[PDB]
Amino acid sequence: GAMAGSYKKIRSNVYVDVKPLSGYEATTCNCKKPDDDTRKGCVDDCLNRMIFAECSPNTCPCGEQCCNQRIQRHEWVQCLERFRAEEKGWGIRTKEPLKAGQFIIEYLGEVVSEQEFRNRMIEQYHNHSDHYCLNLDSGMVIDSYRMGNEARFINHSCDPNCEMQKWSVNGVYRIGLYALKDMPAGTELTYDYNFHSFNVEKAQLCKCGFEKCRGIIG
Ligand SMILES: C[S@@+](CC[C@H](N)C(=O)[O-])C[C@H]1O[C@@H](n2cnc3c(N)ncnc32)[C@H](O)[C@@H]1O
Ligand SMILES: [Zn+2]
Ligand SMILES: [Zn+2]
After folding, report:
1. How many whole angstroms from 67 Cα to the centroid of ligand 2?
2. Which residues hold their Cβ within 5 A of ligand 3, which is an ion?
3. Is the CB of 207 under 6 A from ligand 1?
4. Ranges for the SET domain?
5. Beta strands in the chain (DSSP E)
């Protein structure tokens, strides 16, 4: 019955220490442009998509027809609701059905180096009953304890319907939430923290309720 955790809402990532630069030359896929405004360009066949790179809109042969610029264009689903999830504080659920592979929302926050987060863990996060952090890349981490978006309220499940994917978006790695399977309306979005989130030494009881639930968060 406790109120939701305060944070400052952001529209894009905040780079505190480092930049999550990827070593990429995005963008010379061998995609063919289709003809109808409603036959999308670059499908999974796309060579940028294959290596989780988004096309650039300046160089993509499909132009304004390419459907592989979801993160940079912020093509988030507009049907999320934060809600009281039993035994798991607050969570996020979709209000409309989603489909496997569908991009849902970007995970936002303060991008910090591994060590900066560790310091933060001792000076400020030692009395916390909730943990808001994803691994990004090479010792870098997206911290949403303070600044973030509604993706910070997404809970863990040992049998998840969603996953975090790391994409290079015009040279920078960003993390988005994507559907793993079809999900109907009202469904609580979940991903596996073990794989995606940063480990804390402090264990919490898992309540995901899967038959092979690990019993532990982390
Ligand atoms: C990223 S926050 C998610 C939002 C959080 N439920 C809240 O009320 O702000 C992660 C925290 O939520 C709780 N949590 C997430 N998944 C859980 C689960 N499967 N079982 C029990 N608690 C969970 C834990 O307290 C964890 O530290
Ligand atoms: Zn493209
Ligand atoms: Zn579990």
Report:
1. 7
2. 158, 206, 208, 213
3. yes
4. 78-194
5. 8-9, 14-15, 80-84, 90-94, 103-106, 110-113, 133-137, 140-143, 147-148, 155-156, 162-169, 172-179, 190-191, 204-205, 216-217
